[PDB]
Design an enzyme around this catalytic site. Structure first.
Site, PDB file in Angstrom:
ATOM      1  N   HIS B  41       0.802  -1.223   0.000  1.00 51.00           N
ATOM      2  CA  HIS B  41       0.000   0.000   0.000  1.00 51.00           C
ATOM      3  C   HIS B  41       0.836   1.276   0.000  1.00 51.00           C
ATOM      4  CE1 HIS B  41      -0.164  -0.170   4.592  1.00 51.00           C
ATOM      5  NE2 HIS B  41       0.134   1.121   4.401  1.00 51.00           N
ATOM      6  N   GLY B 143       2.387   6.160  10.253  1.00 51.48           N
ATOM      7  CA  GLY B 143       3.816   6.088   9.942  1.00 51.48           C
ATOM      8  C   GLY B 143       4.480   4.804  10.415  1.00 51.48           C
ATOM      9  N   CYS B 145       3.518   1.698   9.628  1.00 48.32           N
ATOM     10  CA  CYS B 145       3.414   0.579   8.690  1.00 48.32           C
ATOM     11  C   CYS B 145       4.813   0.107   8.246  1.00 48.32           C
ATOM     12  CB  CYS B 145       2.544   0.931   7.488  1.00 48.32           C
ATOM     13  SG  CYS B 145       0.871   1.477   7.927  1.00 48.32           S
TER      14      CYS B 145
HETATM   15  O1  LIG Z   1      -7.845   6.601   7.939  1.00 45.32           O
HETATM   16  C1  LIG Z   1      -6.925   5.795   8.061  1.00 45.32           C
HETATM   17  C2  LIG Z   1      -5.856   5.657   6.989  1.00 45.32           C
HETATM   18  N1  LIG Z   1      -5.315   4.302   6.872  1.00 45.32           N
HETATM   19  C3  LIG Z   1      -6.057   3.529   5.864  1.00 45.32           C
HETATM   20  C4  LIG Z   1      -5.525   2.127   5.711  1.00 45.32           C
HETATM   21  C5  LIG Z   1      -6.317   1.148   5.109  1.00 45.32           C
HETATM   22  C6  LIG Z   1      -5.814  -0.110   4.832  1.00 45.32           C
HETATM   23  C7  LIG Z   1      -4.498  -0.378   5.130  1.00 45.32           C
HETATM   24 CL1  LIG Z   1      -3.834  -1.938   4.741  1.00 45.32          CL
HETATM   25  C8  LIG Z   1      -3.692   0.559   5.743  1.00 45.32           C
HETATM   26  C9  LIG Z   1      -4.206   1.815   6.065  1.00 45.32           C
HETATM   27  C10 LIG Z   1      -3.356   2.824   6.820  1.00 45.32           C
HETATM   28  C11 LIG Z   1      -3.342   2.508   8.317  1.00 45.32           C
HETATM   29  O2  LIG Z   1      -4.240   1.863   8.854  1.00 45.32           O
HETATM   30  N2  LIG Z   1      -2.285   3.021   8.999  1.00 45.32           N
HETATM   31  C12 LIG Z   1      -2.042   2.944  10.392  1.00 45.32           C
HETATM   32  C13 LIG Z   1      -1.430   1.861  11.024  1.00 45.32           C
HETATM   33  N3  LIG Z   1      -1.307   1.697  12.350  1.00 45.32           N
HETATM   34  C14 LIG Z   1      -1.788   2.650  13.128  1.00 45.32           C
HETATM   35  C15 LIG Z   1      -2.424   3.830  12.643  1.00 45.32           C
HETATM   36  C16 LIG Z   1      -2.957   4.829  13.497  1.00 45.32           C
HETATM   37  C17 LIG Z   1      -3.597   5.919  12.981  1.00 45.32           C
HETATM   38  C18 LIG Z   1      -3.720   6.081  11.608  1.00 45.32           C
HETATM   39  C19 LIG Z   1      -3.215   5.147  10.749  1.00 45.32           C
HETATM   40  C20 LIG Z   1      -2.552   3.986  11.236  1.00 45.32           C
HETATM   41  C21 LIG Z   1      -3.876   4.247   6.601  1.00 45.32           C
HETATM   42  N4  LIG Z   1      -6.777   5.009   9.140  1.00 45.32           N
HETATM   43  C22 LIG Z   1      -7.677   4.882  10.304  1.00 45.32           C
HETATM   44  C23 LIG Z   1      -7.819   6.226  11.064  1.00 45.32           C
HETATM   45  C24 LIG Z   1      -8.736   6.040  12.290  1.00 45.32           C
HETATM   46  C25 LIG Z   1      -8.123   4.981  13.223  1.00 45.32           C
HETATM   47  C26 LIG Z   1      -7.992   3.640  12.476  1.00 45.32           C
HETATM   48  C27 LIG Z   1      -9.386   3.173  12.013  1.00 45.32           C
HETATM   49  C28 LIG Z   1      -9.985   4.230  11.076  1.00 45.32           C
HETATM   50  O3  LIG Z   1     -11.282   3.800  10.619  1.00 45.32           O
HETATM   51  C29 LIG Z   1     -10.124   5.564  11.822  1.00 45.32           C
HETATM   52  C30 LIG Z   1      -9.064   4.414   9.848  1.00 45.32           C
HETATM   53  C31 LIG Z   1      -7.078   3.826  11.252  1.00 45.32           C
END
Ligand SMILES: O=C(CN1Cc2ccc(Cl)cc2[C@H](C(=O)Nc2cncc3ccccc23)C1)N[C@@]12C[C@@H]3C[C@@H](C[C@@](O)(C3)C1)C2
Ligand SMILES: O=C(CN1Cc2ccc(Cl)cc2[C@H](C(=O)Nc2cncc3ccccc23)C1)N[C@@]12C[C@@H]3C[C@@H](C[C@@](O)(C3)C1)C2
Ligand SMILES: [Cl-]
Ligand SMILES: [Cl-]
Ligand code: NA
Lengths: 306, 305
Positions: B41, B143, B145
């Protein structure tokens, strides 16, 4: 999201661990530049521990009586000296992996990472805190003496603890890297029991601020308290007095969440009175006190989940 | 004495962390020999994440579109390919600090150490377990990931997890190093959730053994149970079923303490039915399930790396 007991990455310290042997005794040493630091009790027998005369035991030793092993290489000892309760062994090779470092003596309530080692080889890393009674609740077995405690804020390793002993209650005592013990302990086999310990109040408040940042407010209430009334209640539950310095140190966490320090004190007062009533805070059923305000700021998001 | 949540020493993994940038997205990569592994991703914009066609996004990229930084040195990408949900960037320099390693896929209940990373720079190390619902209760921010999970067996690092995403309940999901997700998760922005979780019974028993080794015996009793009666009780408290394999795996702890597994099961049964009655076990008011039988043996024996 999430909140874990997080240690600093240990690689910079792993590259400093060596094995020191004097006769039948083997323990760990910390190799920085051309000096190996280790507990002075490496020169003692079990009998010597009752009333050891370190000066008299040491004078009977030569440089070649100390065997230092770094991985599979023997280092050569070219000098030795005692500074308080540590022995400093000058070796003929500077450690090529010496990180940028400092020796810092910490105060009760401060946290640090421990790299538990046996025979000069690291086995594990965990977080801990200098308790108010100057002991640490470590996880150490026989052979772990010389293992060190440290922090790594901004790529420089701050060494703050060297392990020396386990007390009768299963807690641990040691020195700073200048060989000065934390607390009233001595590197002697004597009746020296850990004093009654207390809870690190400023750290419990910091951890409540972490719970709010991560999105949980159930424990809050409409009340406030004066600092003095809070302390009168706190001491009844064996909590450390909260000082104006602790209130100042909580300032940034108070600003990020919009919750005044004395308002969080009122919440703590109520938690001490009621308990959690089946609930948990950051996955714990107890009030956690081994996270400092600095640790919460390091780990938690800068944006509160409102 | 003492019993702490202990991670493996992280130095062998620290020497593998790099920063990978594709356009405006920056995350972490694992550099082993001449390959950098990272979540696929990294090639997506926020808009792409709604419905990504990774093959079509990747074909539009050149090697020079990927910026890999190891400390203060730019590595040169000379090839790129995708394996499941992991991108593999061939670089012109082999990592001189590559440890002896393997890629292993772990089972739920197994623990590992996480080296949390940001911008290719390690920030912390902590221990965690693959939950029965295939999520991990990690501590990760935007950040993180590309941060990896691992165990060490002698001199060999067994990489078992690469971090991909956070779920709505604040728990985490990721893949093995071959890019296969743990759990029914997908790498896109869509409605996803952690399923109902259960307690890892064999690990709670291992931790009760650790408590006995550390001198806490108040929960021991004169009773025993059959495996079937114990499982009838365990199912009622949302605990994983205990199998004969779990009983066999607890053998060394049962020998060190002299307490039969089914005898400890009788203690666990009473703890589930009565609570702790104001008492704690190894400093906890909850029954801890993120220590495996091997973790207890290793910590109570001083195994080194
Ligand atoms: O909006 C996004 C953007 N992501 C989309 C996404 C989709 C699919 C995959 Cl494979 C990766 C990713 C990437 C991700 O999850 N990164 C991360 C990883 N580890 C810890 C994070 C803490 C904070 C932010 C990113 C974090 C970015 N993340 C969330 C913001 C918030 C808290 C939770 C649940 C939510 O519904 C609400 C969506 C994540
Ligand atoms: O018999 C000894 C041998 N030590 C004496 C001693 C004196 C003074 C100094 Cl400065 C160092 C040392 C050295 C020591 O404490 N080593 C260690 C360090 N870290 C963790 C240990 C766990 C287990 C064993 C040693 C451990 C060896 N220690 C104890 C056996 C048992 C559990 C507690 C309390 C006891 O009352 C009962 C004495 C230790
Ligand atoms: Cl301090
Ligand atoms: Cl004594
Ligand atoms: Na004397």
């Amino acid at each position: 999201s999430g909140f874990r007991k997080m240690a600093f990455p240990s690689g910079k310290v792993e590259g400093c661990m060596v094995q020191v042997t004097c006769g039948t005794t083997t323990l760990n040493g910390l190799w920085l530049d051309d000096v190996v630091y280790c507990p002075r009790h490496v020169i003692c027998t079990s009998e010597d521990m009752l009333n050891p005369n370190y000066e008299d035991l040491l004078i009977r030793k030569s440089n070649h009586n100390f065997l230092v092993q770094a991985g599979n290489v023997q280092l050569r000892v070219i000098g030795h000296s005692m500074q308080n309760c540590v022995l400093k062994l000058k070796v003929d090779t500077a450690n090529p992996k010496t990180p940028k470092y400092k020796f810092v003596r910490i105060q009760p309530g401060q946290t640090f990472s421990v790299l538990a080692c046996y025979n000069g080889s690291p086995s594990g890393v965990y977080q801990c805190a200098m308790r108010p009674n100057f002991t640490i609740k470590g996880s150490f077995l026989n052979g772990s003496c010389g293992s060190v405690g440290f922090n790594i804020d901004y790529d420089c390793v701050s060494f703050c603890y060297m392990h020396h002993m386990e007390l009768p209650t299963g807690v641990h005592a040691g020195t700073d890297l200048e060989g000065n013990f934390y607390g009233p302990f001595v590197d002697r086999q004597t009746a020296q029991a850990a004093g009654t310990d207390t809870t690190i109040t400023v750290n419990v408040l910091a951890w409540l601020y972490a719970a709010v940042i991560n999105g949980d407010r159930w424990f809050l209430n409409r009340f406030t308290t004066t600092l003095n009334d809070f302390n009168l209640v706190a001491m009844k539950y064996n909590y450390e007095p909260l000082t104006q310095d602790h209130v100042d140190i909580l300032g940034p966490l108070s600003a990020q969440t919009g919750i005044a320090v004395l308002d969080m004190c009122a919440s703590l007062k109520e938690l001490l009175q009621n308990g959690m009533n089946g609930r948990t805070i950051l996955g714990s059923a107890l009030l956690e006190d081994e996270f400092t305000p600095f640790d919460v700021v390091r780990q938690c998001s800068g944006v509160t989940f409102q």
